[PDB]
């Protein structure tokens, strides 16, 4: 799975950067991850992935924030499961946010057609935080 170019990733060095720029420039940076105990820690980006043109859906959360992703990109839910975002939307599950922010559900889905999409890889846990504290995952 993969994320739209403009999806913003939290970094220690640079603050929020679009993942498309992080990948295209292979930016060396440190992102935020969550472990099984639900605690945050940092780690460097270890792989940069340009996944080419894929179908992108825009998921609009109850707070109005948007996540634009392929259907199969996993995200963390509140039971600590990492599930494809479309499944989270279809099963009406709350998305996990970092530490104590309110957990919220996806309200609607809108097809955006094919766009060039991106992913990053890390060495432990295989997840990373986006703007607003959502946790994108590529575990399993």
CATH code for the domain in which residue 51 is found? 2.170.16.10
Distance of alpha carbon 94 from alpha carbon 107, whole angstroms: 10
CB 129 within 8 A of CB 9: yes
Instruction: Identify the domain containing residue 100 by its residue range.
Output: 1-140
Q: Is 50 among the annotated ligand-binding positions?
A: no
- Strand runs labelled E in the chain: 3-4, 8-11, 15-18, 30-34, 40-44, 47-61, 66-69, 74-76, 82-84, 94-95, 104-121, 127-129, 135-137
Which among 91, 102, 88 has a CA at the least distance from the CA of 132? 102
Count of the separate structural domains present in the chain: 1
39, two tokens = 């605690």
């Amino acid at each position: 799975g993969a994320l739209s170019y403009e999806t913003e990733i939290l970094t220690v060095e640079y603050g929020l950067l679009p993942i498309g720029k992080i990948v295209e420039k292979r930016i060396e940076c440190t992102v935020y991850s969550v472990d099984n105990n639900g605690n945050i820690y940092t780690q460097p980006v270890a792989q940069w992935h340009d996944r080419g043109e894929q179908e992108v859906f825009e998921y609009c959360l109850e707070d109005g924030s948007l996540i634009r992703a392929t259907k199969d990109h996993k995200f963390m839910t509140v039971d600590g499961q990492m599930l494809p975002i479309d499944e989270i939307f279809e099963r009406e599950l709350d998305l996990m946010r970092v530490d104590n922010l309110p957990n919220i559900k996806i309200a609607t889905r809108k097809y955006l057609g094919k766009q060039n999409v991106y992913d990053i890889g890390v060495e432990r846990d295989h997840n990373f935080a986006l703007k607003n504290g959502f946790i994108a995952s590529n575990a399993d």
